[PDB]
Design a protein around this ligand. Structure first.
Ligand SMILES: *[C@@H]1O[C@H](CO)[C@@H](O[C@H]2O[C@H](C)[C@@H](N[C@H]3C=C(CO)[C@@H](O)[C@H](O)[C@H]3O)[C@H](O)[C@H]2O)[C@H](O)[C@H]1O
Ligand SMILES: OC[C@@H]1C[C@H](O)[C@@H](O)[C@@H](O)O1
Length: 499
């Protein structure tokens, strides 16, 4: 993997502007890629693109393979007469996931019935071909989703045992009885991957690479966990005996208790790591670079007992990261992965990362709270193989962060910036000052959240880790991301050898 010296922008597709309550894979997405090209940007970073449940988090999806039906543009379907679209009164500047849930699912189902009614034979055959091609995960996903309508939205591990345990007759009967519902979920996937593939081709024509993302741990209530319970630490009822998270941090005094099921890595190794090969394969269909959230988990993971309500109780357990990445390398060739190596990082995590040539990350919001700080540009690797951010989707906006920063952080930030020739007068200028610092550094890639380009405060924060609600909702307003913003990004990239 050869990283050129460049910049990019972090913008989850949901945050795009446009009608009907959520950003989608259509014209406004194309406009953003055009904006990015004219700004001199060469990378677009997104978060995981799978279907979300309660909390609306990309990082806890009903499937490790499925695409988010909320990202489906309905306008192309309306043009073909499959559905009539009416705005129910979506807000400006944010996703109302409650109203989106209430309006978009019925609109998708209406489009599916219209499709079965009016679709040309060519479209039906394309849809059927897609299904055959993706059956190895799609049959499980569509039935998993279909079965939730038969059982009050219960998670798979609360379903009647014959279904929970995937008995052959139970499954066969269910697939038959829920044939239409199964087909509708398949249809949402066909549309997602067609629309994404189109958008990927557009990015490629404009010289833009898409950085994707995948959590190390998958979600408890997901189709693949249901299909392969032996791969996870579950009890006889299919419930996790232990769960994922991070220990009592400097940050969180009780930690983060993520709740995800943990892998039986011994079982995965004996099985040949097929889940990981497939995940990476699928990610590489959608993205040019893929980041793995919590990369340190491949070396060792914090195992929290299920009966513990926080992340305080537990232990570190070693994982065969070396074994997995040797296998990936001998089977894919060259690891096109980015390591999310934030948090408590040991020498063993770093050596695993460096052994496989994986670029790590740097976050400038973390750089000013103590000159040996690793997030300060002068401490970055000489080889430059790192991605620098002002903040990620888990951080506040940089203006928001600055407003609550400690006096010592603020003073050291100003001085350190001054050492790099960078000055500012107004606090609203801090996001651009830090973006400038990142671009001046040796990091091959500088990727910035669009909220920092706009210098927005804490209201535009994408995620606040720990809080279960109010997240993943920020959206651009139409025209907010202006030609002048693009020209300023372009000047900065030109001034720092990134164009
Ligand atoms: C890396 O992965 C993180 C873990 O998934 C992700 O975190 C966000 O998404 C989580 C799903 C969300 N909720 C979980 C966290 C808890 C406590 O920390 C539990 O109480 C919930 O039941 C879980 O669902 C996180 O709050 C949220 O930060 C990061 O965004 C990603 O970078
Ligand atoms: O959830 C945000 C971060 C993600 C990261 O992988 C982990 O190390 C911890 O610090 O929390």
């Amino acid at each position: 993997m050869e990283l050129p010296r460049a910049f990019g922008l972090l913008l989850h597709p949901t945050s795009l502007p446009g009608p009907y309550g959520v950003g989608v894979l259509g014209q406004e997405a194309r406009d953003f890629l055009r904006f990015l090209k004219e700004a001199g940007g060469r990378y677009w970073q997104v978060l995981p693109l799978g279907p979300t449940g309660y909390g609306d988090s990309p990082y806890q999806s009903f499937s490790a393979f499925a695409g988010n039906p909320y990202l489906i543009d309905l306008r192309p379907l309306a043009e073909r007469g499959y559905v009539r679209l009416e705005d129910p009164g979506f807000p400006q500047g944010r996703v109302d996931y409650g109203l989106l849930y209430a309006w978009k699912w019925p609109a998708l189902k209406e489009a599916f019935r219209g499709f079965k009614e009016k679709a040309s034979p060519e479209e039906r055959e394309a849809f059927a071909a897609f299904r055959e091609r993706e059956a190895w995960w799609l049959e499980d996903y569509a039935l998993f989703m279909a079965l939730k309508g038969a059982h009050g939205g219960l998670p798979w591990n609360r379903w009647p045992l014959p279904l929970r345990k995937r008995e052959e007759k139970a499954l066969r009967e269910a697939k038959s009885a829920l044939a239409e519902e199964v087909a509708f979920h398949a249809f949402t996937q066909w549309l997602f991957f067609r629309q994404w593939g189109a958008l990927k081709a557009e990015a490629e024509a404009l010289g833009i690479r898409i950085i994707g993302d995948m959590p190390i741990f998958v979600a408890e209530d997901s189709a693949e966990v249901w299909a392969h319970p032996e791969w996870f630490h579950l009890d006889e009822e299919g419930r996790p005996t232990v769960v994922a998270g991070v220990p009592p941090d400097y940050f969180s005094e009780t930690g983060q208790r993520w709740g995800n099921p943990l892998y039986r890595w011994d079982v995965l190794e004996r099985e040949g790591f097929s889940f990981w090969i497939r995940r990476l394969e699928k990610a590489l269909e959608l993205f040019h670079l893929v980041r793995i959230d919590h990369f340190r988990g491949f070396e060792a993971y914090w195992e929290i007992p299920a009966s513990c309500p926080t992340a305080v109780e537990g232990r570190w357990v070693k994982a065969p990261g070396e074994k997995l990445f040797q296998k990936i390398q001998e089977v894919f060739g060259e690891v096109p992965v980015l390591a999310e190596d934030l948090g408590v990082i040991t020498p063993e995590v770093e050596a695993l990362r460096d052994r496989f040539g994986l670029p790590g990350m740097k976050v400038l919001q973390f750089a000013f709270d103590x000159m040996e700080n690793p997030f300060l540009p002068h401490n970055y690797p000489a080889h430059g193989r790192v991605v620098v951010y002002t903040g990620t989707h888990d951080n506040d906006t940089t203006l928001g962060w600055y407003r609550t920063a400690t006096p010592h952080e603020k003073a050291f930030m100003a001085r350190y910036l001054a050492d790099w020739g960078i000055t500012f007068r107004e606090e609203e200028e801090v996001p651009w000052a830090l973006m400038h610092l990142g671009m001046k550094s040796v990091a091959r890639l500088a990727v910035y959240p669009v909220q920092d380009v706009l210098a927005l405060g804490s209201e535009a924060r994408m995620n606040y880790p720990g809080r279960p609600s109010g997240n993943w909702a920020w959206r651009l307003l139409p025209g907010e991301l202006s030609p002048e913003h693009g020209a300023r990004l372009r000047a900065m990239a030109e001034a720092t050898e990134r164009l």
